[PDB]
Amino acid sequence: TTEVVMENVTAFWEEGFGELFEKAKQSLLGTPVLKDINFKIERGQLLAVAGSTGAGKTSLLMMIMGELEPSEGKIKHSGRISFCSQNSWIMPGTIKENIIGVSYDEYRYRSVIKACQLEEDISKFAEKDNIVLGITLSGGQRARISLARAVYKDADLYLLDSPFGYLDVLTEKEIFESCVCKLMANKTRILVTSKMEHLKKADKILILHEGSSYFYGTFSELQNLRPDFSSKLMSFDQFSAERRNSILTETLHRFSLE
Numbered sequence: 398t399t400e401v402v403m404e405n406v407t408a409f410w411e412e413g414f415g416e417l418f419e420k421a422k423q424s425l426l427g428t429p430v431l432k433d434i435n436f437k438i439e440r441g442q443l444l445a446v447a448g449s450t451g452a453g454k455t456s457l458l459m460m461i462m463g464e465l466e467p468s469e470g471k472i473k474h475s476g477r478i479s480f481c482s483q484n485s486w487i488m489p490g491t492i493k494e495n496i497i498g499v500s501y502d503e504y505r506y507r508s509v510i511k512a513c514q515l516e517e518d519i520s521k522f523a524e525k526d527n528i529v530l531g532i533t534l535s536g537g538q539r540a541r542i543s544l545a546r547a548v549y550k551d552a553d554l555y556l557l558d559s560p561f562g563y564l565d566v567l568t569e570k571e572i573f574e575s576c577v578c579k580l581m582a583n584k585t586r587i588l589v590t591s592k593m594e595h596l597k598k599a600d601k602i603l604i605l606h607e608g609s610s611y612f613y614g615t616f617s618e619l620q621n622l623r624p625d626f627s628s629k630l631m632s633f634d635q636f637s638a639e640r641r642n643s644i645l646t647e648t649l650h651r652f653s654l655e
């Protein structure tokens with residue numbers, strides 16, 4: 398498992414532009430994508446990250462993967478990362494080879510396809526998981542294949558960027574319980590999600606809004622620290638993940654800080 402820490406992190410996607418402008422002539426001010434971000438999770442813990450559209454959630458994951466350097470603060474992490482990107486993707490080849498890396502573990506594979514609900518899908522194909530991607534998959538199928546790929550990989554830190562985005566409420570719930578909570582029980586993970594139930598199960602919660610930490614702490618803390626926000630969303634969780642994003646974004650603007 399990895400430990401993960403951000404201490405006072407501020408970052409600007411535009412920083413490079415400023416550096417080139419100064420180079421051509423021989424710290425940047427602007428709109429930070431992330432501002433004064435703090436969190437720590439221990440080995441094996443889950444951090445749920447939520448927030449409004451454009452808040453920096455994906456950008457936060459990108460900093461952990463070394464794609465964006467902090468202009469201020471420190472990030473500490475080590476080890477192997479598995480990343481489930483916000484848009485799904487599929488490489489030419491079988492369903493099974495979309496899921497598995499260099500090595501194959503029969504049992505691990507079966508338990509991944511089971512927890513991501515891919516069994517019923519696969520059983521409707523003449524060639525099962527050996528069907529070649531010819532035929533095209535739904536957005537829901539693709540996203541579940543992409544999550545199985547990320548979770549199958551043996552890693553130290555799993556970064557799951559809205560993997561329930563295109564799923565219904567029921568499928569989202571079973572997969573969250575079987576995969577994220579059971580199958581990955583002992584793994585360090587960061588899940589971008591809009592479900593209040595998910596934040597209730599997390600070890601830590603980070604809510605972002607306009608780049609800033611709207612909230613960091615536990616679920617109990619959230620209910621008292623942001624009591625009107627909490628009250629308005631706690632029936633939000635019966636809406637689709639797709640739909641909960643617009644509502645959550647409205648709700649953060651509604652109870653935005655000072």
Ligand SMILES: Nc1ncnc2c1ncn2[C@@H]1O[C@H](COP(=O)(O)OP(=O)(O)OP(=O)(O)O)[C@@H](O)[C@H]1O
Binds near residue numbers: 430
């Ligand atoms: N990989 C990237 N490289 C550079 N800029 C990025 C990258 N990903 C997102 N951005 C930009 O960073 C800013 C913050 O948005 P980001 O995508 O981090 O928000 P988000 O909270 O993930 O939103 P959504 O909820 O809409 O997925 C946006 O202007 C976006 O265009």
Ligand SMILES: [Mg+2]
Binds near residue numbers: 454559589
């Ligand atoms: Mg999102």
